[PDB]
């Protein structure tokens, strides 16, 4: 009878093992034991992104944001979802919001968020070039 924290830790181990459907299911079990922890949802959202299940990832980002409106990763993963959906202006807005929140929270992700912003703006520009 594992605790919610034990199930999150098992999911994280499976994530290290690149067993993403199994990790996502573990995070679901953690949610069953405590559905009020935003990190369980952003962890699962990242699994769904790795699994190319952007619709399921977006839903988890929304669940996380309801619980933690300041979540950097919820905004970042949401922007990644929107990039795949070709909602470029929304994706850029969420990536800039993740950048702002990470700065406010003194979080260090190297150059990950600016790199994602550059990817998003290039894809937006590429979408313009593909139509003329």
């Amino acid at each position: 009878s594992p605790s919610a924290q034990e199930l999150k830790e098992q999911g994280n181990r499976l994530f290290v093992g690149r067993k993403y459907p199994e990790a996502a299911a573990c995070y679901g079990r953690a949610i069953t034991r405590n559905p009020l922890v935003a990190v369980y949802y952003t962890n699962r959202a990242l699994c769904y992104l790795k699994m190319q299940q952007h619709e399921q990832a977006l839903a988890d980002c929304r669940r996380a944001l309801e619980l933690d409106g300041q979540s950097v990763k919820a905004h970042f993963f949401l922007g990644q979802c929107q990039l795949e959906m070709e909602s470029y202006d929304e994706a850029i807005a969420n990536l800039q919001r993740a950048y702002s929140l990470a700065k406010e929270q003194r979080l260090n992700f190297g150059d990950d968020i600016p790199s994602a912003l550059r990817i998003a703006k290039k894809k937006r520009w590429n979408s313009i070039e593909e139509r003329r």
């Binding site: 994530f15 990190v39 952003t42 962890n43 990763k73 190297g110 990950d112 968020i113």
Partner: peptide, 6 residues
């Protein structure tokens, strides 16, 4: 760094 689980 950001594409990691917490």
């Amino acid at each position: 760094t950001i594409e990691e689980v917490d």
